[PDB]
């Protein structure tokens, strides 16, 4: 309950710093000041062209390594178990498999960027 009140307050006086930022000053709209910025000159082409990602293999491997901190994250709670050598073996197995993954991505030049 108090969490939603706090988030409502934060969103409320973040959007009420915007509605008094647009509606308080005097507006002078003409169709050259609202043009895009290309250091004074007119922009050649749209910015909705495909801007090619060089770090794409690292971006896909980030999706896999971010799952590991959904698996390695219960370790403060997994240390509280009564089958503890098994827990320790499985924890070191998960960090070792992440490390073998990172070593394979290193040595096959997957961490480098293209071009």
């Amino acid at each position: 309950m108090n969490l939603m009140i706090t988030l409502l307050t934060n969103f409320t006086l973040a959007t009420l710093l915007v509605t008094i930022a647009f509606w308080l000053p005097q507006l002078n709209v003409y169709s050259e000041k609202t043009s895009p910025y290309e250091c004074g000159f007119d922009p050649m082409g749209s910015a909705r062209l495909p801007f090619s990602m060089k770090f794409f293999l690292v971006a896909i491997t980030f999706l896999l390594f971010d799952l590991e901190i959904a698996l390695l994250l219960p370790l403060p709670w997994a240390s509280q178990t009564t089958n503890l050598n098994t827990m320790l073996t499985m924890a070191l197995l998960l960090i070792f498999l992440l490390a073998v993954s990172l070593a394979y991505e290193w040595t096959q030049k997957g961490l480098e960027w293209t071009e």
């Binding site: 801007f51 293999l57 971006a59 698996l71 997994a78 499985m90 197995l93 991505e105 096959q108």
Partner: protein, 175 residues
């Protein structure tokens, strides 16, 4: 109407699903899936899964940041469809919303509904446990048991992530 809070968050969940399932553009698809995955960690957080909601929030935030980077790099067109640019996007968006609020209206007026299964219309506060779990949140204990009890599950999941990295680096080669 505050007892219906999980139901209200679930309405916002379906609204986000109609938002990205109409497929305007994967910018706004990522927007709608973030909104649905952020109210879905409020649906499931009211059942006791505070660990298990924050993770589906966080994993999908990383996921939609990656998907944003790809739909700015690969899936980009000159005039992206916002929600209303195409008639086929807006038509099925309005269709999903009207059918969703139609089955809202049929389940609050009648307190029962039937689409394939039968569903109650009372607030889902009714089905909670009337007891306490002591000095442990039980979902944290169950996810902590992934290391003590879930050893084979650890082995197959870690092997699947390892060969996922190997598989992806074998695909994205070209030669």
């Amino acid at each position: 109407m505050m007892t219906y809070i999980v139901f209200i968050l679930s309405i916002i969940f379906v609204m986000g699903f109609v938002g990205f399932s109409s497929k305007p553009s994967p910018i706004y698809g990522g927007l709608g899936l973030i909104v649905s995955g952020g109210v879905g960690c409020g649906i499931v957080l009211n059942f006791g899964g505070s660990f298990l909601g924050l993770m589906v929030f966080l994993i999908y935030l990383g996921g939609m940041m990656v998907v944003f980077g790809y739909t700015t790099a690969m899936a980009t067109e000159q005039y992206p469809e916002v929600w209303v640019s195409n008639k086929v996007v807006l038509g099925t968006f309005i269709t999903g919303l009207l059918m969703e609020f139609l089955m809202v209206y049929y389940v609050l007026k009648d307190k029962e509904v039937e689409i394939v299964f039968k569903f109650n219309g009372m607030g889902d506060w009714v089905i909670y446990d009337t007891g306490d779990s002591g000095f442990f949140s039980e979902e944290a204990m169950g996810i902590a048991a992934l290391y003590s009890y879930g050893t084979w599950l650890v082995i197959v999941t870690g092997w699947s992530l390892l060969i996922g990295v190997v598989v992806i680096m074998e695909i994205t080669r070209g030669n």
